[PDB]
């Protein structure tokens, strides 16, 4: 219902989709080849930058399989993209195993990205709650 | 807005809302492990849910054991699409240096949000600029 | 937007939490303490702010990823729930995920983002199938 203006910094990787009508986000993919040894970490690039609307965010998230099956994981997560960021998309993988390395290739789903709304509140500061009616 | 829910094991209680306003409802676990120091697990939780269409269950680690003892979830926030009917399971893992941490059935691990969720239409681009998408002063 | 959220500053010596540009996700939460994490060490730090999370919504405590880059720092239970009901000071358990450098947090650090949604206030109904 929603459209998200998006742009295939690296043409080579497919576009993101959405696997079932009411599938929450479309996998992000690897634009590099890595590898992460136990408990280390990597900033992998996915190759598309969005254009949230105004009012929402963007919301990294990882895949549940991999973090499974081989204890993957993001450093940051949920990672927040904001509507006003016009960069490539970054995942901060890491590798949560204890012993066993995990080799990431490009093309590879990494990871999911949601976007949802966003309330832009404005803060307003108050000297306690109850004076305020907040108890 | 209701949630239908399937209690798989019919031993846990059902989860629910501790305060009018509270965000989610504690899940729990139907089974009983033992994670050493950097390990992981894949629990169940005894209940599967029929995420209403346009939102998506939010599967969130408790604060209270994720700093006395280090308890975490590997793939938090945990998605749970709207489409998914099967039983709902928690990636915990122990990210405590030296001290294993005892799961036991009955212990809510986690808790279940419900939010809506964008379903985007995702469009191709070559730029943002013909759009008026640029983040010009930003600079991305 | 309208939605104003009721913030205290339980300690004043730092600064109101601000959104940084005008579409942003969250504030940035500042850490009122000092706190020094050995690689794989975690605490729970203070932030100095209560806040009254407006009924029918949930704040979020997000990482903030350029630390979680740079040294590995990361929030044990993130997405931190703040429920509507809350009305403690917020508190980060901030955890050094790096394998052999210590991260070191001075009190006045930006140290997470706090972000405000709606949530659905399901009503469970039991079924005994789908
Ligand atoms: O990062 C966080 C998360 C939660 N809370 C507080 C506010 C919220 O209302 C309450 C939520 O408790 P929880 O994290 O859901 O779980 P627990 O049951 O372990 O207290 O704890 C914080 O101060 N910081
Ligand atoms: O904490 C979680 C996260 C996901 N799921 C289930 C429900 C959801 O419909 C499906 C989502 O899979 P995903 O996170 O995209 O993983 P992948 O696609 O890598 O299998 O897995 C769970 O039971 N618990
Ligand atoms: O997984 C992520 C998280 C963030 N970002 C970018 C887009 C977002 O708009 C910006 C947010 O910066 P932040 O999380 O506040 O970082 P910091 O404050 O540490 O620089 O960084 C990514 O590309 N990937
Ligand atoms: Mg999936
Ligand atoms: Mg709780
Ligand atoms: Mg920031």
């Avoid at 254009?51 to 990294?60: D, E, K, N, S």
């Amino acid at each position: 219902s929603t459209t998200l203006a998006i742009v295939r910094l690296d043409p080579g990787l497919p576009l993101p989709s959405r696997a079932h009508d009411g599938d929450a986000g479309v996998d992000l993919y690897s634009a590099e080849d890595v590898e992460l040894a136990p408990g280390r970490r990597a900033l992998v690039r996915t190759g598309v930058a969005v254009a949230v609307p105004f009012g929402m965010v963007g919301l990294v998230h990882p895949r549940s399989g991999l973090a499974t099956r081989v204890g993957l994981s993001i450093v940051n997560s949920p990672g927040t993209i904001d509507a006003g960021y016009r960069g490539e998309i970054k995942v901060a993988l890491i590798n949560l195993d204890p012993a066993a390395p995990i080799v990431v290739h490009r093309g590879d789903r990494i990871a999911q990205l949601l976007v949802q709304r966003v309330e832009l509140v404005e803060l307003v500061e108050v000297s306690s709650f109850d004076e305020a009616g907040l108890a």
